[PDB]
Design a binder for this molecule. Structure first.
Ligand SMILES: Cc1cc2nc3c(=O)[nH]c(=O)nc-3n(C[C@H](O)[C@H](O)[C@H](O)COP(=O)(O)O)c2cc1C
Ligand code: NA
Length: 357
């Protein structure tokens, strides 16, 4: 196979293996409802084999980025339905990444509410823009409060189904709530959700269980980032962590496992792709730093089943055609990743627009 071979993912048929990774762009409205801009932006990218829509707040009152979308309210379901209808009308496929920001939900973004976490320890290697402010110490969740978080993900997953998505991706990565429980640098707690790997993975696995009850497992993916240092994250043994999870996630019959293979900050290095491919029997989606040539190489070698592209798909609405034809890519402008408005969001050109009609 290569990037342009169709692939089965759950019971969906994806047209190609050029997928769009989830990208927070903070273009939702003040009530966290998707906007006309988001409809146009995702519709422009519907030639992707699959779009994974950006981190979306599962539960009310957990903002980390000010204007991210949510999937807890009726207006949000209706807003997201505009997005999924536009993508389907172009023949694309789209999953929703459902997310709880955990200790990254700064009090100043949430009317003074104290964020929750597996342990009362703040993020220290990143700041929040609100002005630029240090993260605060989160409250340690009691064991008895964890059922309401699981229920919150179940309701988010039911709402995502009503909004017309083809499936959901559970956000188990990048230092947010599920990843904070998973990795021992952020999870110091005792009891059934702390200590050994199987306990630290319990919350993620309990979420996957309820979300699969809503959707059927072949419509649920999970994203993991075992080496990412972002938001003060570390595991003391990432190889053992991903090996255990690769084996255990077979039992959930997921649509896919979406593995970020490296560290945003370049501090933690290990080969996590090899033991994940060896032990995980399902669909392996890889991400981080793939070019078209490398992506074809790793699909053809059998090391991954698909590749999710982040910044290249942000900046190239027609990335699959560009990679197919070996045409130069548009350059991304990081200055507009998180601004408001259409500039740097819906105005990156296609090949044919570039040719100036
Ligand atoms: C502007 C921006 C927003 C992002 N938002 C998310 C997100 O919402 N959820 C997530 O899991 N990863 C997010 N990421 C990480 C991307 O999905 C992706 O892993 C990263 O860009 C590296 O992939 P690439 O090398 O193909 O760009 C974001 C990255 C950027 C640059
Ligand atoms: Na506490």
């Amino acid at each position: 196979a290569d990037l342009f071979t169709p692939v089965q993912l759950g019971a969906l048929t994806l047209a190609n293996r050029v997928l769009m990774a989830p990208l927070t762009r903070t273009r939702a409205d003040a009530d966290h409802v998707p906007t006309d801009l988001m409809v146009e932006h995702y519709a422009q990218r519907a030639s992707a084999g699959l779009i994974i829509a950006e981190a979306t707040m599962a539960m009310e009152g957990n903002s980390a980025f000010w204007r991210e979308p949510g999937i807890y309210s009726e207006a949000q379901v209706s807003g997201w339905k505009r997005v999924t209808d536009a993508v389907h009308a172009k023949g694309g496929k789209i999953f929703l990444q459902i997310w709880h920001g955990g200790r990254a939900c700064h009090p100043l973004l949430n009317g003074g509410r104290v964020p929750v976490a597996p342990s009362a320890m703040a993020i220290t290697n990143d700041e929040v823009h609100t002005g630029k402010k240090a993260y605060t110490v989160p409250r340690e969740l009691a064991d008895e409060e964890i059922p309401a978080i699981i229920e919150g993900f179940k309701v988010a997953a039911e709402n995502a189904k009503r909004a017309g998505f083809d499936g959901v991706e559970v956000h188990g990565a990048n230092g947010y709530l599920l990843d904070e429980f998973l990795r021992d640098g952020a999870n110091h707690r005792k009891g059934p959700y702390g200590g050994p790997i199987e306990n630290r993975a319990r919350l993620l696995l309990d979420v996957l269980d309820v979300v699969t009850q809503v959707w059927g497992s072949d419509c649920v993916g999970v994203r993991l980032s075992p080496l990412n240092s972002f938001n003060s994250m570390k595991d003391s043994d990432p190889i053992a962590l991903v090996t255990w999870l690769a084996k255990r996630l077979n039992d959930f019959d997921l649509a896919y496992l979406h593995l970020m293979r490296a560290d945003f900050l370049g501090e933690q290095q290990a080969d996590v792709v090899t033991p994940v491919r060896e032990h995980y029997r399902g669909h392996l989606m890889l991400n981080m730093g793939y070019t078209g040539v490398e992506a074809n190489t790793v699909i053809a070698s059998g090391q991954a089943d698909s590749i999710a592209f982040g910044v290249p798909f942000l900046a190239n609405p027609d990335l699959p055609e560009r990679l197919r034809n070996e045409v130069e890519l548009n350059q991304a402008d990081p200055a507009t990743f998180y601004t408001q408005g259409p500039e740097g969001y819906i105005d990156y050109p296609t090949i044919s627009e570039l040719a100036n009609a």
